[PDB]
Amino acid sequence: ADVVTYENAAGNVTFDHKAHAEKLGCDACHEGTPAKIAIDKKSAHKDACKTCHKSNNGPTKCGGCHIK
Ligand code: HEC
Ligand code: HEC
Ligand code: HEC
């Protein structure tokens, strides 16, 4: 879909499925075939989201992703 907000206990986080793509052109998050990647407090903190953010001047902070 477009903007998807993950309402977890530690602050909701906002996947701008659209706005990220309006820069990043799907492929950036999706190796050729776009599909539902399992996002969790495992994935989202290990590599998914993180490594891209790390690779730029990303919001490298908990409150940088989570509303608080
Ligand atoms: C990385 C930040 C992403 C961008 C930018 C795009 N997608 Fe994505 N997509 C991403 C995740 C984290 C997920 C899982 C969402 C969930 O809770 O299941 C997805 C999922 C999809 C899906 C599933 C169906 C849907 O979202 O309606 C598809 C088909 C999909 N993504 C397509 C897609 C396209 C076409 C993108 C460019 C406009 C795109 N995604 C960007 C992560 C990210
Ligand atoms: C690169 C492949 C990215 C992935 C994967 C994710 N994000 Fe991201 N994010 C990315 C960029 C380039 C930026 C914006 C930088 C500037 O001009 O471009 C962001 C920013 C965010 C933000 C902050 C928005 C703001 O007000 O600046 C959020 C909330 C964010 N990203 C969340 C987010 C999540 C939760 C992701 C995985 C589900 C994720 N991003 C992946 C690049 C990339
Ligand atoms: C954006 C790239 C994130 C950063 C930086 C951090 N977190 Fe995160 N976190 C992110 C996502 C996409 C999720 C998904 C929701 C889920 O419940 O898995 C999470 C989840 C958490 C949770 C879980 C809360 C719950 O209800 O169980 C916590 C406790 C959490 N995140 C904490 C947290 C902290 C302390 C961070 C800084 C070190 C942090 N997150 C960074 C995305 C992102």
UniProtKB/Swiss-Prot annotation:
<keyword id="KW-0813">Transport</keyword>
<feature type="binding site" description="covalent">
    <location>
        <position position="62"/>
    </location>
    <ligand>
        <name>heme 3</name>
    </ligand>
</feature>
<keyword id="KW-0249">Electron transport</keyword>
<feature type="binding site" description="axial binding residue">
    <location>
        <position position="30"/>
    </location>
    <ligand>
        <name>heme 1</name>
    </ligand>
</feature>
<dbReference type="GO" id="GO:0046872">
    <property type="term" value="F:metal ion binding"/>
</dbReference>
<comment type="function">
    <text>Participates in sulfate respiration coupled with phosphorylation by transferring electrons from the enzyme dehydrogenase to ferredoxin.</text>
</comment>
<protein>
    <recommendedName>
        <fullName>Cytochrome c3</fullName>
    </recommendedName>
</protein>
<feature type="binding site" description="axial binding residue">
    <location>
        <position position="45"/>
    </location>
    <ligand>
        <name>heme 3</name>
    </ligand>
</feature>
<feature type="binding site" description="axial binding residue">
    <location>
        <position position="66"/>
    </location>
    <ligand>
        <name>heme 3</name>
    </ligand>
</feature>
<dbReference type="InterPro" id="IPR036280">
    <property type="entry name" value="Multihaem_cyt_sf"/>
</dbReference>
<feature type="binding site" description="covalent">
    <location>
        <position position="29"/>
    </location>
    <ligand>
        <name>heme 1</name>
    </ligand>
</feature>
<keyword id="KW-0479">Metal-binding</keyword>
<keyword id="KW-0349">Heme</keyword>
<feature type="binding site" description="covalent">
    <location>
        <position position="65"/>
    </location>
    <ligand>
        <name>heme 3</name>
    </ligand>
</feature>
<feature type="binding site" description="covalent">
    <location>
        <position position="26"/>
    </location>
    <ligand>
        <name>heme 1</name>
    </ligand>
</feature>
<feature type="binding site" description="axial binding residue">
    <location>
        <position position="17"/>
    </location>
    <ligand>
        <name>heme 1</name>
    </ligand>
</feature>
<feature type="binding site" description="covalent">
    <location>
        <position position="52"/>
    </location>
    <ligand>
        <name>heme 2</name>
    </ligand>
</feature>
<feature type="binding site" description="axial binding residue">
    <location>
        <position position="53"/>
    </location>
    <ligand>
        <name>heme 2</name>
    </ligand>
</feature>
<dbReference type="GO" id="GO:0009055">
    <property type="term" value="F:electron transfer activity"/>
</dbReference>
<feature type="binding site" description="axial binding residue">
    <location>
        <position position="20"/>
    </location>
    <ligand>
        <name>heme 2</name>
    </ligand>
</feature>
<dbReference type="GO" id="GO:0020037">
    <property type="term" value="F:heme binding"/>
</dbReference>
<keyword id="KW-0763">Sulfate respiration</keyword>
<dbReference type="GO" id="GO:0009061">
    <property type="term" value="P:anaerobic respiration"/>
</dbReference>
<feature type="binding site" description="covalent">
    <location>
        <position position="49"/>
    </location>
    <ligand>
        <name>heme 2</name>
    </ligand>
</feature>
<dbReference type="InterPro" id="IPR002322">
    <property type="entry name" value="Cyt_c_III"/>
</dbReference>
<keyword id="KW-0408">Iron</keyword>
